[PDB]
Amino acid sequence: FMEPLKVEKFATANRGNGLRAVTPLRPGELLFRSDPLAYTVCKGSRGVVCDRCLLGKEKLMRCSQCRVAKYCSAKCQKKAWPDHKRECKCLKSCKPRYPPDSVRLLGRVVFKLMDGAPSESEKLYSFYDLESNINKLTEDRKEGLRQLVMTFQHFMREEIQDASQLPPAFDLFEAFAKVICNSFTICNAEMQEVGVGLYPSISLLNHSCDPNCSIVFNGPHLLLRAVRDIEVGEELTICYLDMLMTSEERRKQLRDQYCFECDCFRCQTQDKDADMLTGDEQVWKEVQESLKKIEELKAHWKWEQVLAMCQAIISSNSERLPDINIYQLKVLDCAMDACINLGLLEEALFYGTRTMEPYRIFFPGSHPVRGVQVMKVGKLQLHQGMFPQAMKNLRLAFDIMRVTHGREHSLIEDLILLLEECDANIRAS
């Protein structure tokens, strides 16, 4: 009921500020929970999940005024009103255009800065403390930031007309630099992207391709946990990137977006790069290309389109391109997720099983994305009466997620129940 702060801000040798433990930490230990300073649904999910709680409830009611924001209840619509009142007229005026996520997010940020009532999200680090990397920014990035600025000014014109209507310390250009640099993709239960937010305190964490911490979201609520034994004074790290990336791809996105090159052992040794790019470049690069179109359809929840593209690609390469190739792998993943959202459970189990061994290799021992994946496969097996396999995978998912999601998490509750149902049928038959 009164757990003490187990982490603290500190200055690193080279990585700027960071976060480190003040006490020894066990895997699964909760380090920090934070509400966002500000957050918003991402473009692809507007109208599919509740603007407030980010859950994908079946039937949503749109805000009468703007008909852009949608809510799962009067409760959520009311609770979100402080975050929505200053943007509503802006969204109405914008139609049929919709602003970029960063512009809508920042639009929420500026009013929260005036709050005056201390934000629990800024307990260790404020919005103004956030790194902007302005000195390191390329000219190409600065031009883009300038565009975001002008877009902001147009999008907000009904509510903000001059710099004097915002705090003086605030600077719009530097703000977008910070947003690009410090924002978090908010994922749901099934590890789907549903939103984006600023979590200034959490933003203290520096990057590693081999992190000692993981993050999982409870709606907009962010939970930070250790995923292995951490010593006193040891820097806490998370992974800014998708795990299914070559060391070259990671080096590029960390540079273009975060203005630094990673020096972790995985990046110094090109760890697992070979396996990732298994197969002939002439073959998998077509897949890599298609992946863009597919991921955009997935973001917009177009599962029928996603499935169509995937099984086309999948069947087309079955004779020459192995599942462990990360681009092929991603397609199998998308295919699986699509089948699940379309009730095609047997087909889902087919694609999902094929992701299992590659996921074990490419993901660390305890990673939330792997855990949830293993959970889905076990469930799909359970639904097909393949009890002993299901039992194996359900146990594994529990083993992982009790560390990544924590025991108190709702998915653990389902998991336990599934474990019982499954372990019964074993002794029974």
């Binding site: 996520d101 924002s183 978090f184 994922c187 992207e193 984006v196 933003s203 791809e249 977006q257 863009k292």
Partner: peptide
């Protein structure tokens, strides 16, 4: 896009 975490299209 942008944001710490999230898939890589």
């Amino acid at each position: 896009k942008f944001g710490k975490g999230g898939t890589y299209p």
